[PDB]
Design an enzyme around this catalytic site. Structure first.
Site, mmCIF file in Angstrom:
data_model
loop_
_atom_site.group_PDB
_atom_site.id
_atom_site.type_symbol
_atom_site.label_atom_id
_atom_site.label_comp_id
_atom_site.label_asym_id
_atom_site.label_seq_id
_atom_site.Cartn_x
_atom_site.Cartn_y
_atom_site.Cartn_z
ATOM 1 N N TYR A 1 -13.852 5.811 18.685
ATOM 2 C CA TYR A 1 -13.011 5.121 17.906
ATOM 3 C C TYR A 1 -12.779 3.772 19.027
ATOM 4 O O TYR A 1 -13.332 2.861 18.863
ATOM 5 C CB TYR A 1 -11.638 5.602 17.695
ATOM 6 C CG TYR A 1 -10.747 4.687 16.661
ATOM 7 C CD1 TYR A 1 -9.678 3.954 17.235
ATOM 8 C CD2 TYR A 1 -11.353 4.410 15.255
ATOM 9 C CE1 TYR A 1 -9.120 3.008 16.226
ATOM 10 C CE2 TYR A 1 -10.863 3.493 14.458
ATOM 11 C CZ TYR A 1 -9.536 2.884 15.156
ATOM 12 O OH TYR A 1 -8.897 1.923 14.272
ATOM 13 N N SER B 1 -15.051 2.323 11.407
ATOM 14 C CA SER B 1 -14.116 1.076 11.516
ATOM 15 C C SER B 1 -14.244 0.653 13.050
ATOM 16 O O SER B 1 -15.264 0.036 13.612
ATOM 17 C CB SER B 1 -12.851 1.889 11.491
ATOM 18 O OG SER B 1 -11.775 0.834 11.107
ATOM 19 N N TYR B 2 -13.029 0.386 13.674
ATOM 20 C CA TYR B 2 -13.250 0.043 15.096
ATOM 21 C C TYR B 2 -14.308 0.626 15.820
ATOM 22 O O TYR B 2 -14.845 0.025 16.721
ATOM 23 C CB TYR B 2 -11.886 -0.029 15.850
ATOM 24 C CG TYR B 2 -11.661 -0.754 17.168
ATOM 25 C CD1 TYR B 2 -12.260 -0.351 18.351
ATOM 26 C CD2 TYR B 2 -11.038 -2.066 17.102
ATOM 27 C CE1 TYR B 2 -12.416 -1.450 19.247
ATOM 28 C CE2 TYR B 2 -11.101 -2.677 18.199
ATOM 29 C CZ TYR B 2 -11.732 -2.488 19.359
ATOM 30 O OH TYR B 2 -11.536 -3.376 20.379
ATOM 31 N N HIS C 1 -12.677 1.252 2.380
ATOM 32 C CA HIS C 1 -12.863 1.639 3.889
ATOM 33 C C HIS C 1 -12.980 3.068 4.142
ATOM 34 O O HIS C 1 -13.400 3.538 5.266
ATOM 35 C CB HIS C 1 -11.756 0.922 4.773
ATOM 36 C CG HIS C 1 -11.936 0.648 6.340
ATOM 37 N ND1 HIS C 1 -12.947 -0.057 6.687
ATOM 38 C CD2 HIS C 1 -11.457 0.888 7.442
ATOM 39 C CE1 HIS C 1 -13.120 0.050 7.967
ATOM 40 N NE2 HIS C 1 -12.010 0.700 8.180
HETATM 41 N N1 LIG Z 1 2.842 -0.474 11.847
HETATM 42 C C1 LIG Z 1 3.060 0.274 12.738
HETATM 43 O O1 LIG Z 1 4.194 0.231 13.707
HETATM 44 C C2 LIG Z 1 1.855 1.230 13.415
HETATM 45 C C3 LIG Z 1 1.883 2.443 13.944
HETATM 46 C C4 LIG Z 1 0.601 3.144 14.244
HETATM 47 C C5 LIG Z 1 -0.736 2.581 13.867
HETATM 48 C C6 LIG Z 1 -0.669 1.274 13.360
HETATM 49 C C7 LIG Z 1 -1.966 0.392 12.798
HETATM 50 C C8 LIG Z 1 -3.043 0.694 13.648
HETATM 51 C C9 LIG Z 1 -4.412 0.092 13.669
HETATM 52 C C10 LIG Z 1 -4.568 -0.638 12.206
HETATM 53 C C11 LIG Z 1 -5.784 -1.132 11.899
HETATM 54 N N2 LIG Z 1 -5.866 -2.069 10.564
HETATM 55 C C12 LIG Z 1 -6.959 0.027 11.912
HETATM 56 C C13 LIG Z 1 -8.218 -1.056 11.669
HETATM 57 C C14 LIG Z 1 -8.910 -1.664 13.196
HETATM 58 C C15 LIG Z 1 -9.977 -2.364 12.847
HETATM 59 F F1 LIG Z 1 -10.630 -2.878 13.787
HETATM 60 C C16 LIG Z 1 -10.812 -2.256 11.560
HETATM 61 C C17 LIG Z 1 -10.279 -1.590 10.317
HETATM 62 C C18 LIG Z 1 -9.125 -1.030 10.687
HETATM 63 F F2 LIG Z 1 -8.486 -0.498 9.568
HETATM 64 C C19 LIG Z 1 -3.333 -0.748 11.045
HETATM 65 C C20 LIG Z 1 -2.087 -0.006 11.462
HETATM 66 C C21 LIG Z 1 0.558 0.635 12.853
#
Ligand SMILES: NC(=O)c1cccc(-c2ccc([C@H](N)Cc3cc(F)ccc3F)cc2)c1
Ligand SMILES: *[C@@H]1O[C@H](CO)[C@@H](O[C@@H]2O[C@H](CO)[C@@H](O)[C@H](O)[C@H]2NC(C)=O)[C@H](O)[C@H]1NC(C)=O
Ligand SMILES: *[C@@H]1O[C@H](CO)[C@@H](O[C@@H]2O[C@H](CO)[C@@H](O)[C@H](O)[C@H]2NC(C)=O)[C@H](O)[C@H]1NC(C)=O
Ligand SMILES: *[C@@H]1O[C@H](CO)[C@@H](O[C@@H]2O[C@H](CO)[C@@H](O)[C@H](O)[C@H]2NC(C)=O)[C@H](O)[C@H]1NC(C)=O
Ligand SMILES: *[C@@H]1O[C@H](CO)[C@@H](O[C@@H]2O[C@H](CO)[C@@H](O)[C@H](O)[C@H]2NC(C)=O)[C@H](O)[C@H]1NC(C)=O
Ligand SMILES: *[C@@H]1O[C@H](CO)[C@@H](O[C@@H]2O[C@H](CO)[C@@H](O)[C@H](O)[C@H]2NC(C)=O)[C@H](O)[C@H]1NC(C)=O
Ligand SMILES: *[C@@H]1O[C@H](CO)[C@@H](O[C@@H]2O[C@H](CO)[C@@H](O)[C@H](O)[C@H]2NC(C)=O)[C@H](O)[C@H]1NC(C)=O
Ligand SMILES: *[C@@H]1O[C@H](CO)[C@@H](O[C@H]2O[C@H](CO)[C@@H](O)[C@H](O)[C@H]2NC(C)=O)[C@H](O)[C@H]1NC(C)=O
Ligand SMILES: *[C@@H]1O[C@H](CO)[C@@H](O[C@H]2O[C@H](CO)[C@@H](O)[C@H](O)[C@H]2NC(C)=O)[C@H](O)[C@H]1NC(C)=O
Ligand SMILES: *[C@H]1O[C@H](CO)[C@@H](O[C@@H]2O[C@H](CO)[C@@H](O)[C@H](O)[C@H]2NC(C)=O)[C@H](O)[C@H]1NC(C)=O
Ligand SMILES: NC(=O)c1cccc(-c2ccc([C@H](N)Cc3cc(F)ccc3F)cc2)c1
Ligand SMILES: *[C@@H]1O[C@H](CO)[C@@H](O)[C@H](O)[C@H]1NC(C)=O
Ligand SMILES: *[C@@H]1O[C@H](CO)[C@@H](O)[C@H](O)[C@H]1NC(C)=O
Ligand SMILES: *[C@@H]1O[C@H](CO)[C@@H](O)[C@H](O)[C@H]1NC(C)=O
Ligand SMILES: *[C@@H]1O[C@H](CO)[C@@H](O)[C@H](O)[C@H]1NC(C)=O
Ligand SMILES: *[C@@H]1O[C@H](CO)[C@@H](O)[C@H](O)[C@H]1NC(C)=O
Ligand SMILES: *[C@@H]1O[C@H](CO)[C@@H](O)[C@H](O)[C@H]1NC(C)=O
Ligand code: NA
EC number: 3.4.14.5
Lengths: 728, 728
Positions: B509, B592-593, B702
């Site tokens: 990841y 994804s990532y 996704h």
């Molecule tokens: N809202 C928060 O504080 C919080 C807490 C823990 C994890 C996250 C969080 C972490 C990563 C995402 C990214 N959209 C995941 C992601 C990365 C990428 F390159 C391509 C698609 C994808 F889907 C979205 C939300 C957010």
């Protein structure tokens, strides 16, 4: 040991086929490009001169895509900034070069992004379409006269066709027709206001941050069709009135009662034009012959001059009603139509008499009428040796129909059995173009005595190269089923040995009026498969195929996805029963309609095929366009043929794909067979748990013809076939 | 002699993990669903009573998706007609059932297609969003008060988040926040008017004749972002004769100077709310603490109560600034922030004092604050045994920070090293949830003396089933790189023999703050690959990974696609040196990532990997969303970080894919990583003549999570990997 014809040879075009593309500019002279120079040849003696030095436009500042000399030889139209659109349409920039003054015109230039341009048939007038409206220039350097003001992107098309008329009716982007001496300009106007749009993404260069959504008015089966109107304007009045009037010629009552199409426009004389209309239910067409009324400035079409053409067994024409060829005085014409026995032959019509006279007959067909003089009509047919896949040029004496001479049959019977022809302006000379079974051969002939003047190109250079290559051979023959002959061809590996069992690949198209079994010489993917991989590549023309009479062609009427599919399976059975085919290694592949048939075959549960490849396949008829689909299937409604529309989809056979290896390929920007069609096939396979191979081609259309995508797809398919057949 | 864990076992969920999801309703009782019946449990004794009969809704007519009981236990909100939207968003229909009168409410019911609904924290008021506007109901059977009137599809969002705020900031569709006793209702309003829209096709069922075009306001890197406003309304003074008055709380000036975001909303007391704002350049955040003024009826945020949080090495917070945990009087709060050593610890703030005091410290990190009383603060951290991939619950005495007690570390060290927790209303009781390395264990405890009351669920049934299966083992360890340790895990085949060579699949990841090496027990694809195919599945946490300090996490600041990609290659290189790894069979895969990293690795030219699979990969950062991308990459402008945006693409590495086998997969309806991203990868590979394998999934997003697509993708990847490793 000589080398074989490899995949790289095909993909890199190492063995190049030479041709001889000339352009007749008169009755005894033609233009030919040699070493980037434009030469003018004297047909009679073969001598020539430089028409336009290749260094003429060295500082033009643009790469010239094509050129067009005006009929009077006074100007040359230079086409650059070529931007392709659909199968025939494209946009470009144009400059006009004054030959005499040897200067480029820089005043009142043709606009950029011009959609279509054409010289008048005589002199140097020009008509062009820009922003969907028609314009006419009487003189190259003078201001244009606007003809229409209704043009509107994706809505109103004046002088150019919309998507479906371009692809299925006219096979051209232009929808304008100059009268013989250039006085009148006739044109069609298409209205796509209520036609639904197909939408798909176009990704473009990596630099584009957001994908673009391409939107095209495209009527799928049963949807709202574009409507059409026809007009004629007198261009000689343009400099005399502020706004010349476009006179409309309305369709007959028999057509106005329901949906219909304009399907042919052909000028008879300076003041008489013929038009053919087709009902949306394509088994009834009407031809009107209209005369200019000098006292009313109007065009009238006498009902006594109206001709009806219908079909009780199928649709009308091979793909549309055929065009008429009028005698000089415009009082009679010749037209190919199917006779009482179901074979297409030439009929002679008096313009005001309803019954015509057939001038040719037999169990073979006329392919096309090529030229008409006061004493002779020249046509191409497959009569010779009763081979439907052969083509020869014939001459029939108009004063004595029993006098028919084959002009090409015996020129070189072993090397040449597939001809096309190109006549000079008044048919004084003709170029014959042999395309098989041997290497293509181009020759020049004089019509006065039908003597050969000279060989233009014999491809001796290529023949020399192929001498050191182990080339495959081609067999063209037939099998008898139900007392009917059905033809097939086989590309056989070098040193073919009938005592061995070779794997077999069935190359299929099989659409209505198709012909995959012929005498044409080709260097293609199959050449490599047979030559290097020792695979037999076969094609079969079963029910639904053309040039063999209506009994065979109309067999699939209202029933696509049945007999033409079943006959390919039966052909494979017949081939294995020939003794030199490994029953465990029979594959099948096809593109477009061929992809649909390939998929239907792989999903039939026949157990005959191990694997198959479908490229850009149709998957369900309601997804394809109205004009083509409805011609063979009628309307997708319960009152008409909805049940068969729903019964002939690839998706309904999903479960059967568990028995085969399938590779599905489609370009994402296919405006013709929408990516949607393969998107539904894949979803149906996923839904029943069937594994398969797939490949999408970003931004490629129905031809997957960009240089890199072309190489990539054949390379990918080669690996798939070699793996299925267990080949090193 | 016994069976292995097969692909079918994984795909059909043969071996199921049991859970114990309870819902605390007070400081002494919780709700638990059993046999469709909702029971209420007494925490102290474990005795229970039926709260709601599973049959109570036998004639309901609709299938209930979920339920929500009002805090006072008087009503139950029934959710049905569920329709998923993005990761967190969805719409549904709702009905309210009165528990006291045992009747379904039929007057003034919540509308269909409701976007969000929530009970007030105390009592039974309701707030819901419908058609992008907020409504409040004081009583379940009484008419609702319209709070906002500006709601407009895809433009104005009241009380709900837009696409980017839903995915990247709040990880929720809800943008509503009730005050502690329900008096006030705070909400955000998003304005996407100028945000560009991503457009893609949706094919739907086979019956849909024309594909549908989905359009979503989605700001890609550097594009125009949505704007935000914040309001607070008093729900105790609503009138059915006058429209509700919402009081706006504006962002501080240091934020209004440029683009910014609202990143956290946390109520402190009945009349004090805190809000954190973040600059678009995510290394500067500001917290405002606002108090209600009874006299003016306004909310004032004193500058003296402002708290700035910034970072000089990267962005602020793990994914966003952390939430504050206020004391009962709201005069001070605890918050996790990066200390001077770069490790995240708990800091104690006075609301009107600039300096905070860290109450924990060390080379490990606090994961989250879980409960707070006047005597203790409870938190989860990875301090135990120095394992960053482990998690335990601790409590720290607020009067003496040197008194820290681990509450879960020693309960069962061999089976349990990864805990999460759920405290009752006043922290009187807590449920511990152990998720590994052994089978999940759920227990209940009392806070007064940390007594272990009882075992709620120990998965002994699964344990009995797994005894008859040859399960893989998991090894968690570290390698050292430049005096720094980096952890990895390996899923090892049953009967692992260090004297044999096993093929190895690197599961990656590696996004910022990610962690793929941990003590969690999982039953997944890797389990099958190791158990049945004898493949070692490894994962490694390199630079950029989380929970080990900013030195490691911020190493990739402004540099995605560099160190995290290089470190995966270095790990594989090290694993390949090990005696039990076949260096001729090393593969890599990610989603994804992880798909981006897998692709960047395969295109690196390292020569370490034979093959790899990328699922829904990012391919160029300018194609991903602004909030996430810019957090790590800054802006794609020549003045900021454009050069690295352009150097970190997968496309630029196309040529290096010539020596590897690659399988690229993507769902066509992916709203997160648009299909576009893979479409540009495939085109780049076609352009340099590299062959590869592909698979699109029609209408999948996704998650490619529909039942049939899920089974199909893992089946397809399994064949690809086995083939790459020459496995039967
Ligand atoms: N809202 C928060 O504080 C919080 C807490 C823990 C994890 C996250 C969080 C972490 C990563 C995402 C990214 N959209 C995941 C992601 C990365 C990428 F390159 C391509 C698609 C994808 F889907 C979205 C939300 C957010
Ligand atoms: C081909 O050669 C003939 C014979 O030399 C050329 O004939 C010319 O014909 C014109 C009539 O237009 C006569 O006035 C001349 O006598 C002929 N030319 C000369 C130089 O005397 C003919 O022009 C040549 N055609 C080409 C294309 O080169
Ligand atoms: C193209 O066809 C459309 C109908 O599909 C015509 O539009 C109508 O025009 C009339 C006359 O003004 C209006 O009253 C209607 O409201 C229009 N209907 C629709 C659906 O737009 C249009 O006039 C035609 N255009 C041309 C140049 O022929
Ligand atoms: C040239 O004549 C045509 C036909 O009369 C004009 O087109 C009409 O224009 C009026 C007003 O602009 C519209 O109400 C009609 O619907 C148009 N009819 C057609 C067939 O397009 C055109 O505008 C005239 N051009 C000039 C410069 O006068
Ligand atoms: C092209 O044909 C048209 C139509 O026959 C010719 O125009 C007519 O010319 C005659 C003179 O012979 C006039 O009496 C008519 O008034 C014209 N009719 C129209 C509709 O214009 C035209 O002269 C021919 N052009 C050329 C170059 O020969
Ligand atoms: C919730 O808290 C609010 C705010 O403290 C309480 O509302 C106040 O109630 C007192 C009555 O004792 C009034 O004098 C204030 O004017 C009210 N303030 C506002 C803003 O309305 C409310 O009573 C509390 N609710 C409960 C159930 O305890
Ligand atoms: C937040 O990060 C930005 C960008 O890294 C810093 O702003 C400037 O960024 C440019 C390059 O984009 C550098 O040339 C400057 O030196 C950076 N600083 C300044 C003041 O312009 C910004 O400094 C960071 N903020 C904090 C508090 O560290
Ligand atoms: C759990 O058991 C206790 C008994 O120890 C139940 O009794 C308490 O609550 C009852 C009503 O809810 C009262 O009738 C009892 O007097 C009261 N007794 C004590 C010692 O508190 C309790 O209800 C049970 N809880 C559940 C959910 O069943
Ligand atoms: C949402 O944001 C838009 C854009 O910022 C606001 O509209 C503004 O921008 C318009 C052009 O897009 C200008 O013409 C206007 O002057 C300006 N205001 C209005 C009312 O159009 C829009 O008002 C915002 N909507 C809300 C509810 O805040
Ligand atoms: C939301 O949709 C539901 C279901 O359609 C509506 O419930 C009733 O549905 C029936 C048909 O099942 C209709 O005839 C009624 O008009 C609907 N209303 C009532 C009161 O019966 C429901 O009404 C819709 N939501 C709202 C707020 O009207
Ligand atoms: N215009 C003519 O008279 C004429 C003369 C010869 C051939 C044709 C002609 C024949 C077939 C077509 C079809 N669109 C081909 C076709 C079929 C299909 F299932 C899917 C895609 C596709 F592309 C279009 C034009 C037309
Ligand atoms: C014409 O231009 C071509 C460029 O393709 C050049 O090779 C050729 O020599 C020129 N013609 C002559 C007669 O030199
Ligand atoms: C065509 O467009 C180009 C590009 O803007 C311009 O330089 C040129 O002058 C245009 N030519 C004409 C005839 O308008
Ligand atoms: C034309 O086709 C329709 C549909 O099959 C049919 O009903 C009609 O009779 C046909 N007309 C002729 C002349 O065959
Ligand atoms: C409620 O219905 C479920 C059906 O899934 C059943 O198993 C259960 O026994 C029922 N509840 C009771 C108390 O019987
Ligand atoms: C409330 O505001 C809306 C929108 O501005 C308006 O249409 C409505 O009439 C108002 N109602 C009252 C009672 O003022
Ligand atoms: C230290 O190790 C890192 C990787 O762990 C490497 O990128 C770097 O060049 C090494 N040297 C220094 C001074 O960081
Ligand atoms: Na206990």
């Amino acid at each position: 040991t000589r080398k074989t014809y490899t995949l790289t040879d095909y993909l890199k075009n190492t063995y190049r086929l030479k041709l001889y593309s000339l352009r007749w500019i008169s009755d005894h002279e033609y233009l030919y490009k040699q070493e980037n120079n434009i030469l003018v040849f004297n047909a009679e003696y073969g001598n020539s001169s430089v028409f336009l030095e290749n260094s003429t436009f060295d500082e033009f500042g643009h790469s010239i895509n094509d050129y067009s000399i005006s009929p009077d030889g006074q100007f040359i139209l230079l086409e650059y900034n070529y931007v392709k659109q659909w199968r025939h349409s494209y946009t470009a920039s144009y400059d006009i070069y004054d030959l005499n003054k040897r200067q480029l015109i820089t005043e009142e230039r043709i606009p950029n992004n011009t959609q279509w341009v054409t010289w008048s048939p005589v002199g140097h007038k020009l008509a062009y379409v820009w922003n969907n409206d028609i314009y006419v220039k009487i003189e190259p350097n003078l201001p244009s006269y606007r003809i229409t003001w209704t043009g509107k992107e994706d809505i109103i098309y004046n002088g150019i066709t919309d998507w479906v008329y371009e692809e299925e009716v006219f096979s051209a982007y232009s929808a304008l027709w100059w009268s013989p001496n250039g006085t009148f300009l006739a044109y069609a106007q298409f209205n796509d206001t209520e036609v639904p749009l197909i939408e798909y993404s176009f990704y473009s260069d990596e630099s584009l941050q957001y994908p673009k959504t391409v939107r095209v008015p495209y009527p799928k089966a049963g949807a709202v069709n574009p409507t059409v109107k026809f007009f004629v304007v007198n261009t000689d009045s343009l400099s005399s009135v502020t706004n010349a009037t476009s006179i409309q010629i309305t369709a007959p009552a028999s057509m106005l009662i329901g949906d219909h199409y304009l399907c042919d426009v052909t000028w008879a004389t300076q003041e008489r034009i013929s038009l053919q209309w087709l009902r949306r239910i394509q088994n009834y067409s009407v031809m009107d012959i209209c005369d200019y009324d000098e006292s009313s400035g109007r065009w009238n079409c006498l009902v006594a001059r109206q001709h009806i053409e219908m079909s009780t067994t199928g649709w009308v024409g091979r793909f549309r009603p055929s065009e008429p060829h009028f005698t000089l005085d415009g009082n009679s014409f010749y037209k190919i139509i199917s006779n009482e026995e179901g074979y297409r032959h030439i009929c002679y019509f008096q313009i005001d008499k309803k019954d015509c006279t057939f001038i040719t007959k037999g169990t073979w067909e006329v392919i096309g009428i090529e030229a008409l003089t006061s004493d002779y009509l020249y046509y191409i047919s497959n009569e010779y040796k009763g081979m439907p896949g052969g083509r020869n040029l014939y001459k029939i004496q108009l004063s004595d129909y029993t006098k028919v001479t084959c002009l090409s049959c015996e020129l070189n019977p072993e090397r040449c059995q597939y001809y096309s022809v190109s006549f000079s302006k008044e048919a004084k000379y003709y170029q014959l173009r042999c395309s098989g079974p041997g290497l293509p051969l181009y020759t020049l002939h004089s019509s006065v005595n039908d003597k050969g003047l000279r060989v233009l190109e014999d491809n001796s250079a290529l023949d020399k190269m192929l001498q050191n290559v182990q080339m495959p051979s081609k067999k063209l023959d037939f099998i008898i089923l139900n007392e009917t002959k059905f033809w097939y061809q086989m590309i056989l590996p070098p040193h073919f040995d009938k005592s061995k069992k070779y794997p077999l690949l069935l190359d299929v198209y099989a659409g209505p009026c198709s012909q995959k079994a012929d005498t044409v010489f080709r260097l293609n993917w199959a050449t490599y498969l047979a030559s290097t991989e020792n695979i037999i590549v076969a094609s079969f023309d079963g029910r639904g195929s053309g040039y063999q009479g209506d009994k065979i062609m109309h067999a699939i009427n209202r029933r696509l996805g049945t007999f033409e599919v079943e006959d390919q399976i039966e052909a494979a059975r017949q081939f294995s029963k020939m003794g030199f085919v490994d029953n465990k290694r029979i594959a099948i592949w096809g593109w477009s309609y061929g992809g649909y048939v390939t998929s239907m075959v792989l999903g039939s549960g026949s157990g005959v095929f191990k694997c198959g490849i479908a490229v850009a396949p149709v998957s369900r008829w309601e997804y394809y366009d109205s004009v083509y689909t409805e011609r063979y299937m009628g309307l997708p409604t319960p009152e008409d043929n909805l049940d068969h529309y729903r019964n002939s989809t690839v998706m309904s056979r999903a479960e059967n794909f568990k028995q085969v290896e399938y590779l599905l390929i489609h370009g994402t920007a296919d405006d013709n067979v929408h990516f949607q069609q393969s998107a539904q096939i894949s979803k149906a396979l996923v839904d029943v748990g069937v594994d398969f191979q797939a490949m999408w081609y970003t931004d490629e259309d129905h031809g997957i013809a960009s240089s890199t995508a072309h190489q990539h797809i054949y390379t990918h398919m080669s690996h798939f076939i070699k793996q299925c057949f267990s080949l090193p």
